[PDB]
Design a protein around this ligand. Structure first.
Ligand SMILES: CCCCCCCC/C=C\CCCCCCCC(=O)OC[C@H](COP(=O)(O)OCC[N+](C)(C)C)OC(=O)CCCCCCC/C=C\CCCCCCCC
Ligand SMILES: CCCCCCCC/C=C\CCCCCCCC(=O)OC[C@H](COP(=O)(O)OCC[N+](C)(C)C)OC(=O)CCCCCCC/C=C\CCCCCCCC
Ligand SMILES: CCCCCCCCCCCCCCCCCC(=O)OC[C@H](COP(=O)(O)OC[C@H](N)C(=O)O)OC(=O)CCCCCCCCCCCCCCCCC
Ligand SMILES: CCCCCCCCCCCCCCCCCC(=O)OC[C@H](COP(=O)(O)OC[C@H](N)C(=O)O)OC(=O)CCCCCCCCCCCCCCCCC
Ligand SMILES: CC(C)CCC[C@@H](C)[C@H]1CC[C@H]2[C@@H]3CC=C4C[C@@H](OC(=O)CCC(=O)O)CC[C@]4(C)[C@H]3CC[C@]12C
Ligand SMILES: CC(C)CCC[C@@H](C)[C@H]1CC[C@H]2[C@@H]3CC=C4C[C@@H](OC(=O)CCC(=O)O)CC[C@]4(C)[C@H]3CC[C@]12C
Ligand SMILES: CC(C)CCC[C@@H](C)[C@H]1CC[C@H]2[C@@H]3CC=C4C[C@@H](OC(=O)CCC(=O)O)CC[C@]4(C)[C@H]3CC[C@]12C
Ligand SMILES: CCCCCCCCCCCCCCCCCCOC[C@@H](O)COP(=O)(O)OCC[N+](C)(C)C
Ligand SMILES: CCCCCCCCCCCCCCCCCCOC[C@@H](O)COP(=O)(O)OCC[N+](C)(C)C
Ligand SMILES: CCCCCCCCCCCCCCCCCCOC[C@@H](O)COP(=O)(O)OCC[N+](C)(C)C
Ligand SMILES: CCCCCCCCCCCCCCCCCCOC[C@@H](O)COP(=O)(O)OCC[N+](C)(C)C
Ligand SMILES: COC[C@@H](NC(C)=O)C(=O)NCc1ccccc1
Lengths: 1273, 119, 173
C-alpha cells in the first residue's frame, strides 16, 4: 500500500536494529518481484512528490530484520542500499551520503558514463595517437575516478552486504582504475594498453539488458561440457592416427642427383640459409615459397628427371603444417574439423603419401568435421529452446476539397498499386542492363529511362501527398520509405553510382504480396528488434577483439615484415591499424583463421598468436551461432501465432487482380454469346505371362546387376584407354549387349504394364529416355555417321546411365522422394535469394564495371607499378616494345550482372573471394592501371554483402528447408522420411539399447579364491584403476614424435609392452572371475576383442619389421593400439549418449551417402568426358585433374564441401588465345586443343556445389538434429 | 631499429671503460651481412674517426690516438655491440658513435655515447 | 596430356605405316631440348644401323636405298621439346620388317642445373600382304553373338513355360 512509503529516519534504523536483535534471538526468501534493478509492483501506485530519491525504509518484509534501506528513482526502479555507515564513518543521514545516493540514482549520471565510455572507445582506435591526447586520457581517468568515488560514498567499499565490492562488475571498474593509475605512476607498454582495453567492457554494465544477455550466453556455454569433451577426445584420436600414419611425410623434397665438388647432402644442408640458396638444390615450382613435395610410392608426386625424393629440411607453411608431433597433428586435425583451408592440407598429404590416403580424409571430414559441428549446433539449439520456454512461462505467469476528393478517387484505386508494382519491376530489370563494354547510345537510353522512372515516382509521391495531407501521409512506414527513396533519387538527379543504386530498395515493396519475401524482412527486423541486444553484444565483442589484436601485434607487423613479405612491405592482411585488425577478426568469424595466423606467429610468437586466435574463434563463433539460432527459431516459431486474419483488408493488388479476372470472365461470356449469335483370350494370357516375368525377383536382380555392370563400364574411358586396345574392343561389344538387353526389358515392361500405366510413371519415363538415347547413338554409329557434330556430342549423355539405379534402390528412392517433396519451397527461397542478390550485383556492377583490367608481366604475373604504365594506352605502348606484357582482366569480375552473380556466389561461399576483393580495393577507374588499396574502403561493400546476403539468406534458406521436412514428417504420420520400411524395424529394435535396466549381479562362484577374485573385479576401485591405466597408455602414445632417439624408441616400446601385459592380466582376471557370464556384456566382449587384436598386432609388427620389409604395412598394422584407448568411452556417460545418437542416425546417413555417391559418380563421368584436356593451371595440376576416374573422384570429393571449387573452375573459363591453345596437339591421342567451355563449366560446378548444399548440409543436419532429440529423452 | 646507449658516461682516470651500444632488431644477426661503423669525435661538430668496424669479422683499425687499447666486448649474435677501452687518459674524453645496419632490416641505427674522464 | 601409346607391329605391303615413339616427361611443366636417332635391324641381319636423325626441326635421313624417299617426320612439330617422335613410312616394302630403336636424347633445363638423360624404345615390325583381323575383335564378336543368343533363348523358354502354366491355371479355374 502507498502508506508503506515512509522515510528512513534514525528511529527507523533503531527499530531495525531491534528487529535484528529479535533475529539473533530466533537464531524464508526475499521477494523476487522486489529485488534491486527491477520496477515496483503497481500495487504501490505513484511516488509522493517529496519522496523520490530519498532513503526510504525497506519495502521488503524479508529484510525487516536486517539493516537495509531503499531508494527510488524517477522512473520506477528500486535500489537496495545498506544502513551500516559507509567506511565505519559516514552515516545514512549524512549530507555526503545523501547527495552521493541522489547522484548515483540520477539517470544523467549513467548517461554521462555511457557517453564517456563510447568516446574512450573511439580514442582506443589509434595506432599512434598524437602527443596531446594525454589530456583527454587524464579527463577519462578522472571521470572514472569520480564515478567510482560516488559509488563508494553511496554504498560503502566492502562493509557487509550491498557494498561496492560485492557486485562483480565493480571489480572490473576497480581493476581498470588501479591499472590506469599504476601504468601512469610507473611511466611493456603493449600489455598496459591491452589492459586499458578493458574499459570497453563497462558498456555491458551501463547499457541495459546486456548483462542479462551475457548471463544467458554463459548459461548456454555451460551446457556444452559433454560436447567439448567428445570433441577433444575425437580430435585426439584422429591426431594419434594421423601422427602414426604421416609422421615426417611432409619433409619430403626433390634433391639434385648430380652434386659437384664431391659434396654430400649433409654438407649442403649445413650451409644453406636463403630461399635462393635452397632453390639451387631442391625443385621449386615457379613463384612458390616451399620446395615441391614428392613421394616414394607410385601414386605420390613425381620428381623431375635428375632429382630424387629425400626426407630432409622443414615442413611447409613456415614449418607449421606437419604431423611430426602430437601438438602439430592436433592443430592439423582442428583445422580439418573447422574445414579452414583444409584442401591445401589434403593435396599436400596426398602428394607426399599417396592418393590411396584420401580414405583418411574422407573418414575425418564426415565422422569429425560434420557430425561434431552438427552436435554443437543441436546442443545450442536445445539450450536456446529450453531458455525460450522458461521465458514464455515466466511471462505467462473550399476549392481544395474538390481536388482532394478527385485525386483521392484517382490515385487510391487498386490499379494504381498494380501499375506502380509493374513500374518498379520494369525499372529494376532496366537497370540490370548495364555492362562495362556499353556503347554511347546505350548509355543515353539508360539515362533517359532512369529519368522517366524517377519522374513517374516523384509525380506519384506528389499526387499521393496532395490527395491526403502530410499529417496522414507520414503515418505509414511504406509512405515514409517511398518519400526517402524518391527524395534521395531527386538529390542524385540534381547532383553518383551509390545514389543511383539506392533506388534498388523499392523492390521490397513486393513483400506485401510475396509471403516468403516478408520472412526475410522479419528476420532482418528481429536482428535489430527483439535481438538488438544480442547484435549489440556481437558488435562490442568484435570491436574489443579488433582493438586487442591491434594493440598486441601492430608493432610486430610493422617491424618483422620481411619475415612474411619478400618485398618488405605490409601484407594484404595485417593488424597494424584498426581497419585491418577488424577485417582480420571478421575473416576469422567467416571461417578463415590459419593463413593469417601463420603470419601472426611468424612476426609475434606462437604463444601469443595462438592464444588470441583461439579466444577470438571460440567466443566469436559461440556468439554468432547463438544469434543465428535465436533468429532462426524466433522467426520460424514466434511469428506463427495467428495474430490477425489472412489479408482481412484485401491488398490493393489482390483487389485489382480480382477485378481483372472478373473483367476477363465478362469478356469471355460476351464473346461467346456474340459468336454463338453470329454463327483375344491368348493375348490376355500373354500379358499375364509378361507381367509374371517382369515382376519376378530373379529378373529384378538380373537387371540390377546389368545396371551396375554398364554403370561401371563407363569408368574405364580415361585418357589412357588408347593403351588398352583389348579393353576398348571388349567395352564396345559390351555396350552393344547392354543396349540390346535394356531394349528387350523395355519391350517386356510395355507388354506387361500397358502404355498408359508405363507412361504415367516417372521412373519408367526416365528409363525410356535413357534407352532412347542409347538406341539413337547405336543406330547413328551403325549407319556410319558417328562423327556428325551433335551426334558426337550426344555420346556424352551416356554418363546418365547410372541414373537407372535410383528406381532400383529403395533407400535412394526414399531420399529422392524427400528431395522431390521439398523442391517447391527450395524454388521459392531460391527466387527470393536471386531477387535479393540482384541488388548487390547491380550495385557491384556500378562500382566495379571494367576496373579490374591491369597491365601485367606474363613471366612473373606481377602488376606493373602505376608510375610507369598508368593507363591502357601506355600498357599498349609498352607491349609494342617488350613482348611478355599483357592488358589482362580477371576471369570472374563485375562486368555484367551474370558475372556479378558468379562473383557474389564466390564471395558468399568464401572461395576465391580474396582475389575479387584485392582487385576491387585496388581499382582506380576504367582504363586506368590499378593502385595498391587506392579504394581501400571498398571492403565495406563485401562486409555488408557477407552479412546480409550470406547470413540472413542462409537464415531464411535453412529455416524454410527444415519446415518443409517437418511438414513432410507430419504428413506421413510422424514417420522418418529418410529411412526405408526395412530400416524402420532395425531402428525401433535399436532404440531399446539406450534404455535397458541393469541386469541381476553375476552370481559369486563357489571357490573361496575365485570368489575373492570376484570381489576385486567387481569394484569401482578396479574400474577407476583400469580407466587411469588407459589414460596413461594414451599419454605414452602422445609423447612420441619424429626424429626421436633410439633410446626413446626402445623405452617407449617396453612401456607399451608392459601396458599390454597389464591389460591382458585384468582381462584374464575378469574371465576367471565371471566364468561364462563374461560374454553377456557388449563392453566386455569389446574389451576381449581389443586385447586380442593388440597382442596380434604387436607380434605382427615385430615380424614385419624383422622378417619382412614394408614400412607402409608396418605403420598401418601399428594402428591396432588405438583400440586400447577407445575404451575410455565405456565409463564416460556424457559422450556415450552422443555416440548412441550417431549410431542411431547411421541408417539414414547411409541412404544419403549412397545418393551422394551416385551423384558424384555421374559428375565424375561427365568431367572425364569434358575437362580431360584443359590446361594445367590453378587447381588443375599433374595430380588433381579430370584425366582419370580416381582423379575426378578426388576432385569431386574435395569440392563436395565447397573447397577450392573456384580454383578448379578457373582453368575451365579459358576459351580463346592467349589464354588457351585451340589447336594444341596431345601426344598419343586424337583430341586437339586445351581450351575450356565456360558455359558447361559454370553449369557443372554451380549445380554440383548446389546439389552439395541440399544434401551435405540441409539433409545431414536435418537427420542428426532429428536423432539428437531422441537420444536426449 | 632501436638503439640503447647512455647519453653521458663518466669514468675515472686510468680505469677501463665499457661503452654500452645495443640494438633490438627483429631479424637474426646474419654475420655475413651485418655492418658496423663505430666512430669518434672530440665534439658533436667535430669530424668522426673510424676505429672499430665489423664487415665479416671484428676488425680494429688501431688508430694511433687509441693505440692497442680499443677492443670489442660484446657480440652481434647477442645484440650487444659494446666497446671496451683500457686505462682511459684525459684525451679520450669526447663523443663515441656506433652506426648499425642489420639486414634484411632497412632502418639504420645510431648510438651516441659521451665519455667523460674523472679525476 | 601426354600418353605413351605403343606402336603397331604389322604393316601391309604396298601401303603406308606410322611407327609410334612417344616418350613423355615425368613433369610436364619443365623445359627440355630433345632430339632422336632411329636405328633399324632388318629381319635377316645382325647389326643395328642408323637410318635418320631429327634435331632442330630438320630431319637428316642417312643415305639408305631402303628408306630413301619412303620416310617422313610424323612426331611433334614446331618445338625443341619433342614428346612424340614418330616417323611415317609412305610406301611399305619387305625391306621394312625388323627391329626399330628410337633413341631419345633429352636435356632438361633447371635452375642452376642441367640434366642430360636418354631413353630407348624398341619397336618390332612385321610386314604382311593382307591386314590380319585382331584376335580380340574376332573373339569379342563371337562372344557377343553367343551371349545375345543365349539370353534370348533363356527368355523365350521361360516365356513358354510360364505361359503354359498360366493358361493351364486359367482353364482350370
Ligand atoms: C576461451 C579460450 C580458448 C583458447 C585458450 C587457449 C588454448 C590453447 C593454447 C594455445 C597455445 C599453447 C602453446 C603456446 C606456445 C608454445 O609454447 O609452443 C611450444 C611448441 C613449439 O614447438 P616448436 O619449437 O616445434 O615450434 C617451432 C616449429 N618450427 C621450427 C617448425 C617453426 O608448440 C608447438 O609445437 C605447437 C603449438 C600449438 C599446439 C596446438 C594447439 C591447438 C589448439 C586447438 C584449440 C582446440 C579447442
Ligand atoms: C582402429 C582401432 C581398432 C578397433 C578395434 C575394435 C574393433 C571392434 C570390436 C568389436 C565390437 C563389439 C560390438 C559390441 C557387441 C555387443 C553386443 O552383443 O551387443 C550389440 C551392441 C549393443 O550392446 P549391448 O550392450 O546391448 O549388448 C548386450 C549387453 N547388455 C545386456 C549388457 C546390454 O550393439 C552395438 O551397439 C554394436 C555396434 C558397435 C560396433 C563397434 C563400434 C566400432 C566401429
Ligand atoms: O492394370 C493394367 C490392366 C491390367 O494389366 P494386367 O497386367 O493384365 O493385370 C494383372 C493383374 N494381376 C490382374 O488383376 O489382371 O491393363 C489395362 O487396363 C491396360 C489399359 C491400357 C491399354 C494397354 C494396351 C497396350 C498393352 C501392351 C502393348 C504392347 C505393344 C507391343 C510392344 C512391342 C512388341 C514387340
Ligand atoms: C572417437 C570416435 C570413435 C568412435 C566411437 C568410439 C568407438 C567405440 C564404440 C564402442 C563399441 C563397443 C560397444 C559395446 C556394446 C555396448 C553397447 O551397448 O553399445 C551401444 C551403446 C549403448 O550403451 P548402453 O550402456 O547400452 O546405454 C548407454 C547409452 N544410452 O552406445 C555406445 O556406446 C555407442 C556405440 C556406437 C559407437 C559409434 C559408432 C559409429 C562409428
Ligand atoms: C524487381 C525485379 C528484379 C523482379 C524480377 C523478377 C520478376 C519477373 C518475377 C520473378 C519472380 C516473381 C515473384 C514470384 C512469386 C510471387 C508470389 C505471388 O504470391 C503468391 O504466390 C502468394 C501465395 C499465397 O498467398 O499463398 C505474387 C507474385 C510474386 C511476388 C512474383 C512477382 C514477380 C517476380 C518477382
Ligand atoms: C526430356 C524431353 C526430351 C522429354 C519430354 C519431357 C519429359 C520430361 C516429360 C514429358 C511427359 C512427362 C510425364 C507426363 C506424365 C506423367 C505422369 C504423372 O502422373 C500422372 O499423370 C498419374 C496420375 C496422377 O498422378 O494422379 C507424373 C509425371 C509424368 C511421369 C511426367 C514427367 C515428365 C515428362 C516425362
Ligand atoms: C547499401 C550500401 C550503402 C551498402 C554496401 C555498399 C557501401 C558500403 C558502399 C557503396 C558506395 C561506397 C563508397 C564509394 C566510394 C568510395 C571511395 C573510395 O576511395 C577512393 O576512391 C579513393 C580516393 C583517393 O584516394 O583519392 C573508398 C571507398 C568509398 C568511400 C566507398 C565506401 C563503401 C560504400 C559506401
Ligand atoms: C548406389 C549407386 C552405385 C553405382 C555404382 C556404379 C558402378 C561403380 C563401379 O565402381 C568401380 C569402378 O569405378 C572402377 O573403375 P576404374 O577405372 O578404377 O577401374 C579400372 C582401374 N585401373 C585398373 C585402370 C587402374
Ligand atoms: C544435362 C542433362 C541433365 C539431366 C538431369 C536429369 C535429372 C533427373 C533426376 C532424377 C529424376 C527422376 O524422377 C524423380 C522422381 O522423384 C519422380 O517420380 P516419383 O518418385 O515422384 O514417382 C512416385 C514414386 N512413389 C511415391 C510412388 C514411390
Ligand atoms: C555420409 C556417410 C555415409 C556412410 C555412413 C555409414 C553407414 C554405414 C552403416 O550402415 C548402417 C546400415 O544399418 C544402414 O544400411 P542398410 O540398408 O544396410 O541397413 C538396413 C539393412 N537392410 C534391411 C536393408 C538389409
Ligand atoms: C562417398 C565418399 C567419397 C568417394 C569415395 C570413393 C571410393 C574411393 C575412391 O578412391 C580412388 C583412389 O583410391 C584413387 O587413387 P589410387 O591410388 O587408388 O589410384 C591408383 C591408380 N593406379 C596406379 C593403379 C593406376
Ligand atoms: C564447417 O563448414 C564447412 C563448410 N565448408 C567449407 C570448405 O568451408 C560448409 O559448410 N560446407 C557445406 C557446403 C557445401 C556446398 C556449398 C556451400 C557449403
Amino acid at each position: 500500500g502507498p502508506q508503506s512509503f515512509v522515510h528512513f529516519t534514525k528511529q527507523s534504523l533503531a527499530l531495525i536494529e531491534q528487529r535484528i536483535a529479535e533475529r539473533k534471538s530466533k537464531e524464508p526468501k526475499p521477494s523476487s518481484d522486489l529485488e534491486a534493478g527491477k520496477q515496483l509492483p503497481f500495487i504501490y501506485g505513484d511516488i509522493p512528490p517529496g519522496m523520490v530519491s530519498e532513503p526510504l525504509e525497506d519495502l521488503d518484509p524479508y529484510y525487516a530484520d536486517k539493516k537495509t534501506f531503499i531508494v527510488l528513482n524517477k522512473g520506477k526502479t528500486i535500489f537496495r542500499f545498506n544502513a551500516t555507515p559507509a567506511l565505519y564513518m559516514l552515516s545514512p543521514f549524512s549530507p555526503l551520503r545523501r547527495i552521493s545516493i541522489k547522484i548515483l540514482v540520477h539517470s544523467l549520471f549513467s548517461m554521462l558514463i555511457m557517453c564517456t565510455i563510447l568516446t574512450n572507445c573511439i580514442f582506443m582506435t589509434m595506432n599512434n595517437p598524437p602527443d596531446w591526447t594525454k589530456n583527454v586520457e587524464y579527463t577519462f581517468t578522472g571521470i572514472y575516478t569520480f564515478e567510482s568515488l560516488v559509488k563508494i560514498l553511496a554504498r560503502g567499499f566492502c562493509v557487509g552486504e550491498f557494498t561496492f565490492l560485492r557486485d562483480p562488475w565493480n571489480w572490473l571498474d576497480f581493476v581498470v582504475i588501479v591499472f590506469a593509475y599504476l601504468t601512469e605512476f610507473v611511466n611493456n607498454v603493449s600489455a598496459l594498453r591491452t589492459f586499458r582495453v578493458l574499459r570497453a567492457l563497462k558498456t555491458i554494465s551501463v547499457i541495459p539488458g546486456l548483462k542479462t544477455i551475457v548471463g544467458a550466453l554463459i548459461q548456454s556455454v555451460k551446457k556444452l561440457s559433454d560436447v567439448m569433451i567428445l570433441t577433444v577426445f575425437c580430435l585426439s584420436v584422429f591426431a594419434l592416427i594421423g601422427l602414426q600414419l604421416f609422421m615426417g611425410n611432409l619433409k619430403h623434397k626433390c634433391f639434385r642427383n648430380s652434386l659437384e665438388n664431391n659434396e654430400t647432402l649433409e654438407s649442403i644442408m649445413n650451409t644453406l640459409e636463403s630461399e635462393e640458396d635452397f632453390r639451387k638444390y631442391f625443385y621449386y615450382l615457379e613463384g612458390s615459397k616451399d620446395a615441391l613435395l614428392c613421394g616414394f610410392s607410385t601414386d605420390s608426386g613425381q620428381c623431375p628427371e635428375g632429382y630424387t625424393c629425400v626426407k630432409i629440411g622443414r615442413n611447409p607453411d613456415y614449418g607449421y603444417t606437419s604431423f611430426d608431433t602430437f601438438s602439430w597433428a592436433f592443430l592439423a586435425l582442428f583445422r580439418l574439423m573447422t574445414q579452414d583451408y583444409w584442401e591445401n592440407l589434403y593435396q599436400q598429404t596426398l602428394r607426399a603419401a599417396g592418393k590411396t590416403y584420401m580414405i583418411f580424409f574422407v573418414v575425418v571430414i564426415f565422422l569429425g568435421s560434420f557430425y561434431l559441428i552438427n552436435l554443437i549446433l543441436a546442443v545450442v539449439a536445445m539450450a536456446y529452446e529450453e531458455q525460450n520456454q522458461a521465458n514464455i512461462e515466466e511471462a505467462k505467469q473550399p476549392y481544395w476539397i474538390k481536388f482532394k476528393k478527385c485525386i483521392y478517387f484517382i490515385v487510391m484505386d487498386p490499379f494504381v498499386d498494380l501499375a506502380i508494382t509493374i513500374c518498379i519491376v520494369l525499372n529494376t530489370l532496366f537497370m540490370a542492363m548495364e555492362h562495362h563494354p556499353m556503347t554511347e547510345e546505350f548509355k543515353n537510353v539508360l539515362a533517359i529511362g532512369n529519368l522517366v522512372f524517377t519522374g513517374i515516382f516523384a509525380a506519384e509521391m506528389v499526387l499521393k501527398l496532395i490527395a491526403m495531407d502530410p499529417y496522414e501521409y507520414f503515418q505509414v512506414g511504406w509512405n515514409i520509405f517511398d518519400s526517402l527513396i524518391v527524395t534521395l533519387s531527386l538529390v542524385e538527379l540534381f547532383l553518383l553510382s551509390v545514389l543511383r543504386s539506392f533506388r534498388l530498395l523499392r523492390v521490397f515493396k513486393l513483400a506485401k504480396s510475396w509471403p516468403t519475401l516478408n520472412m526475410l524482412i522479419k528476420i532482418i527486423g528481429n536482428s535489430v528488434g527483439a535481438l538488438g541486444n544480442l547484435t549489440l553484444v556481437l558488435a562490442i565483442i568484435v570491436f574489443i577483439f579488433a582493438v586487442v589484436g591491434m594493440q598486441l601485434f601492430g608493432k610486430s607487423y610493422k617491424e618483422c615484415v620481411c619475415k612474411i613479405n619478400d618485398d618488405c612491405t605490409l601484407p594484404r592482411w595485417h593488424m597494424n591499424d584498426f581497419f585491418h585488425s577488424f577485417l582480420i577478426v571478421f575473416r576469422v568469424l567467416c571461417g578463415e583463421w590459419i593463413e593469417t595466423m601463420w603470419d601472426c606467429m611468424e612476426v609475434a610468437g606462437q604463444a601469443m598468436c595462438l592464444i588470441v586466435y583461439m579466444m577470438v574463434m571460440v567466443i566469436g563463433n559461440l556468439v554468432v551461432l547463438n544469434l543465428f539460432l535465436a533468429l532462426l527459431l524466433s522467426s520460424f516459431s514466434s511469428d506463427n501465432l495467428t495474430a490477425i486474419e489472412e489479408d482481412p483488408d484485401a491488398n490493393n493488388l489482390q483487389i485489382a487482380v480480382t477485378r481483372i479476372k472478373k473483367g476477363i470472365n465478362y469478356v469471355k461470356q460476351t464473346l461467346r454469346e456474340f459468336i454463338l449469335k453470329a454463327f483375344g483370350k491368348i493375348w490376355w494370357n500373354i500379358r499375364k505371362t509378361c507381367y509374371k516375368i517382369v515382376e519376378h525377383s530373379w529378373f529384378e536382380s538380373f537387371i540390377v546387376l546389368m545396371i551396375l555392370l554398364s554403370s561401371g563400364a563407363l569408368a574405364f574411358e580415361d585418357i589412357y584407354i588408347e593403351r588398352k586396345k583389348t579393353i576398348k574392343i571388349i567395352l564396345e561389344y559390351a555396350d552393344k549387349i547392354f543396349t540390346y538387353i535394356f531394349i528387350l526389358e523395355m519391350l517386356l515392361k510395355w507388354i506387361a504394364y500397358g502404355y498408359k500405366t508405363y507412361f504415367t510413371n516417372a521412373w519408367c519415363w526416365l528409363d525410356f529416355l535413357i534407352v532412347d538415347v542409347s538406341l539413337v547413338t547405336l543406330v547413328a554409329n551403325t549407319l556410319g555417321y558417328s562423327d556428325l557434330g551433335p551426334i558426337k556430342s550426344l555420346r556424352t549423355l551416356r554418363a546418365l546411365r547410372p541414373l537407372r539405379a535410383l528406381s532400383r534402390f529403395e533407400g535412394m528412392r526414399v531420399v529422392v522422394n524427400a528431395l522431390i517433396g521439398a523442391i517447391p519451397s527450395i524454388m521459392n527461397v531460391l527466387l527470393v535469394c536471386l531477387i535479393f542478390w540482384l541488388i548487390f550485383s547491380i550495385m557491384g556492377v556500378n562500382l566495379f564495371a571494367g576496373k579490374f583490367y591491369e597491365c601485367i608481366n606474363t613471366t612473373d604475373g606481377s602488376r606493373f607499378p602505376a608510375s610507369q604504365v598508368p593507363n591502357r594506352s601506355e600498357c599498349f605502348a609498352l607491349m609494342n616494345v617488350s613482348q611478355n606484357v599483357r592488358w589482362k582482366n580477371l576471369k570472374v569480375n563485375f562486368d555484367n550482372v551474370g558475372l556479378g552473380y558468379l562473383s557474389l556466389l564466390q564471395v558468399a561461399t568464401f572461395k576465391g573471394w580474396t582475389i575479387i576483393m584485392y582487385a576491387a580495393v585496388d581499382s582506380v577507374n576504367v582504363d586506368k592501371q590499378p593502385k595498391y588499396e587506392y579504394s581501400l574502403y571498398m571492403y565495406i561493400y563485401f562486409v555488408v554483402f557477407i552479412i546480409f546476403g550470406s547470413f540472413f539468406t542462409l537464415n531464411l534458406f535453412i529455416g524454410v528447408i527444415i519446415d518443409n521436412f517437418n511438414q513432410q514428417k507430419k504428413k506421413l504420420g510422424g514417420q522418418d522420411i529418410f529411412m526405408t520400411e526395412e530400416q524402420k524395424k532395425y531402428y525401433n529394435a535399436m532404440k531399446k539399447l539406450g534404455s535397458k535396466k541393469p541386469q541381476k549381479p553375476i552370481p559369486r562362484p563357489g571357490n573361496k579364491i575365485q570368489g575373492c577374485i570376484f570381489d576385486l573385479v567387481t569394484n569401482q576401485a578396479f574400474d577407476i584403476s583400469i580407466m587411469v591405466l588407459i589414460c596413461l597408455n594414451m599419454v605414452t602414445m602422445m609423447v612420441e614424435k619424429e626424429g626421436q632417439s633410439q633410446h626413446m624408441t626402445e623405452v617407449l616400446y617396453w612401456i607399451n609392452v608392459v601396458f599390454i601385459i597389464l591389460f591382458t592380466g585384468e582381462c584374464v582376471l575378469k574371465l576367471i572371475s565371471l566364468r561364462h557370464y563374461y560374454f553377456t556384456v557388449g563392453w566386455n566382449i569389446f574389451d576381449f576383442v581389443v586385447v586380442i587384436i593388440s597382442i596380434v598386432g604387436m607380434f605382427l609388427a615385430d615380424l614385419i619389421e624383422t622378417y619382412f620389409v614394408s614400412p607402409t604395412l608396418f605403420r598401418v598394422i601399428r594402428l591396432a593400439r588405438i583400440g586400447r584407448i577407445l575404451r575410455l568411452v565405456k565409463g564416460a556417460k556424457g559422450i556415450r549418449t552422443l555416440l548412441f545418437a550417431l549410431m542411431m542416425s547411421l541408417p539414414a546417413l547411409f541412404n544419403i551417402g549412397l545418393l551422394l555417391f551416385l551423384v558424384m559418380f555421374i559428375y565424375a563421368i561427365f568431367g572425364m568426358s569434358n575437362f580431360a584436356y584443359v590446361k594445367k593451371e590453378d587447381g588443375i595440376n599433374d595430380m588433381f585433374n579430370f584425366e582419370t576416374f580416381g582423379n575426378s573422384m578426388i576432385c569431386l570429393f574435395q569440392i563436395t564441401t565447397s573447397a577450392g571449387w573456384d580454383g578448379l573452375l578457373a582453368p575451365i573459363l579459358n576459351s580463346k588465345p592467349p589464354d588457351c591453345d585451340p589447336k594444341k596437339v596431345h601426344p598419343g591421342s586424337s583430341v586437339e586443343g586445351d581450351c575450356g567451355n565456360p558455359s558447361v563449366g559454370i553449369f557443372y560446378f554451380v549445380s554440383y556445389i548446389i546439389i552439395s548444399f541440399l544434401v551435405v548440409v540441409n539433409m545431414y543436419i536435418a537427420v542428426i538434429l532429428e536423432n539428437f532429440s531422441v537420444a536426449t529423452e | 631499429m632501436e638503439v640503447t646507449v647512455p647519453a653521458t658516461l663518466n669514468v675515472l682516470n686510468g680505469s677501463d671503460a665499457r661503452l654500452p651500444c645495443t640494438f633490438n632488431s627483429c631479424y637474426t644477426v646474419n654475420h655475413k651481412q651485418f655492418s658496423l661503423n663505430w666512430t669518434y669525435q672530440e665534439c658533436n661538430n667535430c669530424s668522426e674517426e673510424m676505429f672499430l668496424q665489423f664487415r665479416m669479422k671484428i676488425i680494429n683499425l688501431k688508430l694511433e690516438r687509441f693505440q692497442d687499447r680499443v677492443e670489442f666486448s660484446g657480440n652481434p649474435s647477442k645484440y650487444d655491440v659494446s666497446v671496451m677501452l683500457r686505462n682511459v687518459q684525459p684525451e679520450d674524453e669526447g663523443i663515441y658513435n656506433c652506426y648499425i645496419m642489420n639486414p634484411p632490416d632497412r632502418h639504420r641505427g645510431h648510438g651516441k655515447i659521451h665519455l667523460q674522464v674523472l679525476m | 596430356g601426354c600418353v605413351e601409346v605403343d606402336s603397331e607391329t604389322e604393316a601391309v605391303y604396298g601401303m603406308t605405316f606410322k611407327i609410334l615413339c612417344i616418350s613423355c616427361k615425368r613433369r610436364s611443366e619443365t623445359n627440355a631440348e630433345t632430339f632422336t636417332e632411329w636405328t633399324f635391324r632388318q629381319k635377316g641381319t645382325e647389326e643395328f644401323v642408323k637410318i635418320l636423325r631429327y634435331e632442330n626441326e630438320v630431319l637428316q635421313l642417312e643415305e639408305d636405298e631402303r628408306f630413301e624417299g619412303r620416310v617422313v617426320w610424323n612426331g611433334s612439330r614446331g618445338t625443341k621439346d619433342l614428346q612424340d617422335l614418330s616417323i611415317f613410312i609412305t610406301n611399305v616394302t619387305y625391306n621394312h620388317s625388323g627391329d626399330y630403336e628410337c633413341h631419345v636424347y633429352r636435356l632438361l633445363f633447371f635452375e642452376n642445373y642441367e640434366h642430360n638423360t636418354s631413353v630407348v624404345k624398341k619397336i618390332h615390325i612385321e610386314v604382311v600382304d593382307k591386314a590380319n583381323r585382331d584376335m580380340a575383335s574376332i573373339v569379342s564378336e563371337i562372344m557377343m553373338y553367343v551371349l545375345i543368343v543365349v539370353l534370348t533363348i533363356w527368355l523365350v523358354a521361360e516365356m513358354i513355360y510360364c505361359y503354359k502354366k498360366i493358361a493351364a491355371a486359367t482353364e482350370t479355374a
